[PDB]
Amino acid sequence: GKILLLNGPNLNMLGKREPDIYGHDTLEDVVALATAEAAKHGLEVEALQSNHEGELIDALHNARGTHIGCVINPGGLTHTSVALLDAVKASELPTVEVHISNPHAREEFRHHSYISLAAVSVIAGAGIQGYRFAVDILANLKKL
Amino acid sequence: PGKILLLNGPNLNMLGKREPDIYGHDTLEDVVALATAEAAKHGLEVEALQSNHEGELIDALHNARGTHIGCVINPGGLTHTSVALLDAVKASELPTVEVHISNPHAREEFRHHSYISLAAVSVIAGAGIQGYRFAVDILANLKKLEH
Amino acid sequence: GKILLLNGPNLNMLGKREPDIYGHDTLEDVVALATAEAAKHGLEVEALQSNHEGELIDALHNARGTHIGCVINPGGLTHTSVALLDAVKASELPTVEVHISNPHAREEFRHHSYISLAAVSVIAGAGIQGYRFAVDILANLKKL
Amino acid sequence: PGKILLLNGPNLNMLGKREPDIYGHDTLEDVVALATAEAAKHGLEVEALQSNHEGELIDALHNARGTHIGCVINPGGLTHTSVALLDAVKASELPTVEVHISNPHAREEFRHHSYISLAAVSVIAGAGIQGYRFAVDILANLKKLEH
Amino acid sequence: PGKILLLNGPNLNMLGKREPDIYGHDTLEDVVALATAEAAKHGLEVEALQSNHEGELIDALHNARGTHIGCVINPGGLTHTSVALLDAVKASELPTVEVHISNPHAREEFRHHSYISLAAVSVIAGAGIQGYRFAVDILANLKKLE
Amino acid sequence: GKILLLNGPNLNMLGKREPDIYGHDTLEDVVALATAEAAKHGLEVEALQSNHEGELIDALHNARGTHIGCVINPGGLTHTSVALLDAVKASELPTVEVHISNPHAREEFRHHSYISLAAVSVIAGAGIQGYRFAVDILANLKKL
Amino acid sequence: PGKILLLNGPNLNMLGKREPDIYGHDTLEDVVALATAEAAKHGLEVEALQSNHEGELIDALHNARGTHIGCVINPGGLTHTSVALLDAVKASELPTVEVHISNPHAREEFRHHSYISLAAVSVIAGAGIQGYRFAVDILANLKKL
Amino acid sequence: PGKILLLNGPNLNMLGKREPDIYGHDTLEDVVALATAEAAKHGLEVEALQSNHEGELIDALHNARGTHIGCVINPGGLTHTSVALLDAVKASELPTVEVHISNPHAREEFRHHSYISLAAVSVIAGAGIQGYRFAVDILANLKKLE
Amino acid sequence: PGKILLLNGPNLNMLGKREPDIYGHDTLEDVVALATAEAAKHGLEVEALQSNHEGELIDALHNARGTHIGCVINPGGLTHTSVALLDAVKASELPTVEVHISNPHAREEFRHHSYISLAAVSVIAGAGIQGYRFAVDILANLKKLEH
Amino acid sequence: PGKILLLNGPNLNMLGKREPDIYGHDTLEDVVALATAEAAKHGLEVEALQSNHEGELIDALHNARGTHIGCVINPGGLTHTSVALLDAVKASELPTVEVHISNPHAREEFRHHSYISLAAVSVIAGAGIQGYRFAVDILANLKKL
Amino acid sequence: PGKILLLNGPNLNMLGKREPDIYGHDTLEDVVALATAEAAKHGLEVEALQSNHEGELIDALHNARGTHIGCVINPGGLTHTSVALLDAVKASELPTVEVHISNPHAREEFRHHSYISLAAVSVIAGAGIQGYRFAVDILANLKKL
Amino acid sequence: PGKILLLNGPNLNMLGKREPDIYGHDTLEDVVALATAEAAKHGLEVEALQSNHEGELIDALHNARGTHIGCVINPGGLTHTSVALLDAVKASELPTVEVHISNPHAREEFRHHSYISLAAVSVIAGAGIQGYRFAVDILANLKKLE
Which domains occur in chain B, in start order? Predict the structure, then answer.
């Protein structure tokens, strides 16, 4: 069983700026944590990070029927992309939306999510542990 | 070690009653049991309170200041309306996880705003009652001065 | 057969200020009128007035399955309380919303009603006779 | 004693035709009959007019000034759009009850505003055609200088 | 002689009895008489129409194209609501003066917008029925220059 | 088989102002084009143009069950009339909304259409050819 | 003997030069001349002020309280922006006619709102400088009643 | 002697420990003591109630009708949200002074609206707990004139 | 004579896959075939491109400037969001017909705004894939300096 | 020795005459008198200015920088409209108490917003002229700490 | 010979003192000096005015009509509020470059709107006092063409 | 020498032919040449990239972190729409000058908002391609002080 792990724009920079101020956790840390949780359920993870909205949409489309679900952190595309929302819908994958930080503690333009309209679940502000909980949700939906 | 304050707001006592094949079969008892079981995995306890009275939830937040490690709250309809409850979360100084069973963003526009999200360390929506399990996990693992 | 008659905040003050300016009708008048109409249909009325939103919600919850319907004048909670709307829904009682005055002739913040989203019927500006008409609606829905 | 002006606006002539098991089987004839029967209980008469033409309803309001005791109106879609109809209600000086068969607040956002509600003594929504019966009862019992 | 189209929209037939504290006690007959007297000073005539029917005002505008020097219009409630009536004023090509008896910008917020003001050469509000007299003056003097 | 062709306020003035600036096409041109397209499908056209909203509503009501569909250019009523929207719904006719010009290139108050909420299809800015395409849509829906 | 306060707000001194396709070829001198001549037909006088300084218009309104029969005002850009000027019109207790040379409701959205229209007995827009003549007519005939 | 109703809404019991950088270190006891001392200067008494329950504040207002010279209220969060509490202030007929410790108009936009300000005779914000002292002064002097 | 640029935006490749009895059975291949067939009736050709990448559609618009007679575009979700795509339509100077298969006005409020409608000569919504056929007809018949 | 800058903005000179049912029968002289007498109880002086000219209030704020302990201001209609005046209060670095005689949040919606409240340490509304006395009390006791 | 009108609106006289973390440590004297020196490199002169009085800026715009090659303006808080000043820029017919020391679109929402940007040929924000140098460069080179 | 990243977003490759009445007749080559000449005056180089692809601009920003003294960006349409691009400017830690050829605040209301202005040190609009010259000047002089 395979989960699609998608990380959107800027997520490649996790842990790359001064980590004492901007965080020590890296994208590799995110993938490893999601992968280890998936392994507890006999599942695998296909991970992709891209600063290109089209590469995420292509990935969602290509995973239709082949994956049990999608964990997505869309980054700034959260607030802006109808096309990304329509790609989650077209994929027909049960999708969990993850934010490492709590967008509602940030600027008001970050409060709105298009993805939240189609996501089965939304996890914000749990740090990279949101990706662990997202894998648990998809593992357990699939079992039901 | 320590105690988590579990707060369920108005209407949460009625979980599982209306059209369960559409809205869910899980009950408030199931919620408290699931959170209490996850807390035990971390050597923690849960003090659960459900109320239809905003002031009862505010009283509980105030009384838990300095004696509890954190709060898991599902404010129900107060989520969208109560400044006083947000100020009670801040006054408690409890690190707070906001939980919704359903995804409010899939519902009416008035349900898309949360006062509690402004102060919550984390917000979990649409994971069913599993949201409460992940909330207990977050509070168990939070360290002083994180983020 | 029993109808739940709920009166929200401030309704206890009906008829208590100078009645020539603020009205002669009292809460007792409201309960008696609803009760007499209910009696015409072989029905009874359980009446509660509270300045506490929680006492109304508790009442709605406790009347689930035991009452044929709810007549509610929510007072200022009309415009503000999502929790009260969700309590009407959770009660599963057919609910008639009553306003003694016409809110639409008052300040604009009184124009919006959360209760109107779940109420079967809304009666405004008929004075205390709105409670009579509300009982008639519930008596006749029950008969069908 | 006296005559009530019963006004039904655009589309009310088509009551009972579209998906009646969902929207209703009652007809305009049923509405006029029900209001006329309630009026008779109070020694009153009804003059009923339905029109798809705003100006016909305005003409009728003007012509009823001083000769009728009040107006029961269901403006249909004009409810949300017509300042001229509101001004015609005011010009008629008829105490006016606004009636909707369905509850407009359960429908699209544009149906939540009513110009007529600003001038109406009473507004009844969602009582089916029984709304017209209660409206006649209100006008029968209204006293000069009430509220 | 040249002719001015005087159009009064819904409810203006009720002038005199209609909310006098707002509209005064002057009647539609008084409005037409004053406009007619002012036009005569300029050697002009007035063709007056009041209707409660938006389509009658539109028909009148179309039918006045090319035979009238201009239009004086009080659209009443239709002021705030009718795109169709604005489009009829434009299609008539009549220089159009918009008149209101009350001052709508001192009244409810729903009266603050005017479709007709987008096409009117001039707008007069709150001058009781004298607005119609000034409107005729505007049109007589526009025609003299053009 | 009959199509109801409705033209709303001001459409009678098509081609009547200086045509080099305001257009040469006339209402007669619109009716002839729709009629000729309908004839290609063995269908007829009943055409009505009115500056009166009530005459359009009456027409829609009277065509219930007797016509295969309605082509409507509502003119300025597009943006304003809930009553006209409710008349399209009450008619139960499959309805195509036509604009000769593109309203979205005009003032912002012309961007909103009530009719678009009930119309099966919306054609804007194709000139009078939008009426031809509207007839094609209704001919082909009827065949299915 | 009866006196009308004629106030013109910012930029009105530039009439005849300022954006002629919007405001026309008439001058502030033409405006004052027309208002003055109309007032004389009613046996009234005109005290005219134009200023680019809001405070000078407000002082003029206060100073005319109880001594003048009314005010004709074209506030210019202050029409859309100044609560202080609205409050000065109300403090003056002068019946006030608001005049605009241009039709503001045919221009940018920010010109659609007028604080002065909340207190004005009458508003005239788009009649060129003739709006000032009609405004004197209004004030002359309100006083006469 | 005359009596002033001092009402503090939700969270004000936590004054002292609650967000001191915003609310200061003065306690509810300090608030009640200062109001009580000021009232005594005017030969008046204070009946103080704090509650986290909107209905207890409403009950208190109803029950103070006709036995209190006025009300000093800090509604806390309910300021921005409660029509019911405004309606209770109105029904009490108590001359009402609205007090805020912080300046809400310098804070989040959701704190910029006040239902209570629609019925309050006066509103004092941002004067720490001294707002309650000035509020008592307002009510003592209103009563002296009326 | 000449070539029409047919652009289909994000997700249009997935046409016909999700709940086809509800959303439709027609495919992107059907769209290209229908537009290509109508173009042939007018002695015209079609260059079709579908992409999930906004920049690919912008590149295509730029590369078609002066070499194509017009553009038929269904921007998909970019309709509501992309200023850059509107500016690419303007930079191409291609007369452009905007096509939607479904009627966006019957859907969520955010789908009611189109940047492309501001520059498009025509907008067709809700004619199914027949919209693309009418779009090709419009471009075939457009004359220089019309309207 | 300590000096308080007392500023009154447009129309305040008309107190006692201007819309008495809203503003009452007290005068600007009563306001300055009350503020002056309260300041004296704290051993402070008052420098009072009223102007219908925004620029005169802004100059006064700049000129009081570093020499005064605080500002009491009633901006009048400028309360709702002037970013320049807010920026003048911030440039002054004076602790500022905003005073309104009327309760603006009980009046027209356009009076609900105050640029000055963004910088003011305190806002008093609806206490008649007594708000100016409480404002001096605030400034006296902030300085004392 | 060619003359540039340099206008600074309210509070700009307080540069170097006013909220240094937002506006920096440069003075109005530094601003005028930099603009003057840049204009000289193009053989142009600068006529500089700063005022806390909107009416003084409007008078300056009118008085520079036809005699000056362009205007560099920092309107201060009036940027967001004054239709009268926008209309004065249009009446002047001067090519106008709008300058802000701070980046207003990085500050409070009420600073996001500029009436002046509707008429300005160019807008420079956040370049400190160097924006005034670039503004002279723009005006010098528009005139040269 | 130090290097400045010059980024041009969608449609700017079409400068010269694109709506000249709005953007002028200067080409992207001219933009790059002018920025390059100005940088040389300060002993600096320019690395220029134009793309119609938001992700290529983001990749460029990430890849320029720590090797460039600053960024000059004209985001084109993405200005008003892209949170992702703002977040990339922030993550790059490059002092960033935002440049527009046209004055967007004199144009459609949808052009009035800029995400990039929230992180840019400076914003220059409406100076034709000279905005890029001033932008280089800003970055050369910021670097000299820091």
Answer: 10-30+44-141 (3.40.50.9100)
Which tokens go with L80? Answer: 């008003």
Chain F neighbours among E 4-63 (CB < 8 Å)?
53-56, 58-59, 62
User: Rounded CA gap, L7 and L24, in Å?
Assistant: 19
Question: Could you give the residue numbers annotated as active site of D?
Answer: 23, 100
Q: Can you read off the two tokens belonging to residue D23?
A: 């929207």
* Closest to I4 in 3D by CA, of I131, I136, I121: I136
Query: Which are the catalytic amino acids of I?
Result: 23, 100
In single-letter form, the type of residue at position E56 comes to E
| Alpha carbon distance L58, A75 (integer Å) | 12
Touch of I by F (3+ CB pairs closer than 8 Å) = yes
CB atoms within 10 A of CB F144: 4
Residue E124 CA to residue C132 CA, distance in Å, equals 50
E85 CB near a chain F CB, below 8 Å? yes
Nearest CA to G116 among G128, G104, G126? Answer: G104
DSSP states along F61-128: HHTTTT-SEEEEE-GGGGGT-HHHHHHHHHHT--EEEEESS-GGGS-GGGS--SGGGT-SEEEESSTT
I77/A86 Cβ within 8 A: yes
Q: Are strands G122-125 and I122-125 parallel, antiparallel or unpaired?
A: unpaired
User: What is the Cα–Cα distance from B43 to B1, expressed in whole angstroms?
Assistant: 6
Nearest CA in chain I to F116: I105
Is L100 annotated as catalytic? Answer: yes
CA distances to B54, C12, C58, H70, H89 from H59, in Å = 16, 10, 18, 15, 11
Helices and strands, counts by H and E, chain K: 5, 5
Segment holding L141, helix H or strand E: helix L130-145
* Residue E40: partners with Cβ closer than 8 Å, 6 or more residues away: none
Question: Which residue of C lies nearest to B76 if distances are taken between CA atoms?
Answer: C83
Q: Enumerate the β-bridge partners of residue C5.
A: C47, C71
Resolution in A: 1.8
Structure obtained using:
X-ray
How far does CA F11 lie from the centroid of its chain?
Answer: 10
| Alpha-carbon span G103 to E95, nearest angstrom | 14
- CA D59, D65, D69, D74 torsion: positive or negative? positive
**Contacts within 8 Å (CB) and 24+ apart, K38-42:** K38/K132, K38/K133, K38/K136, K38/K137, K38/K140, K39/K4, K39/K136, K39/K140, K42/K2, K42/K136, K42/K137, K42/K140, K42/K144
Q: Where are the beta strands (DSSP E) in chain B?
A: 2-8, 44-50, 70-74, 96-100, 122-125
Of A99, A93, A96, nearest to A77 (Cα)? A99
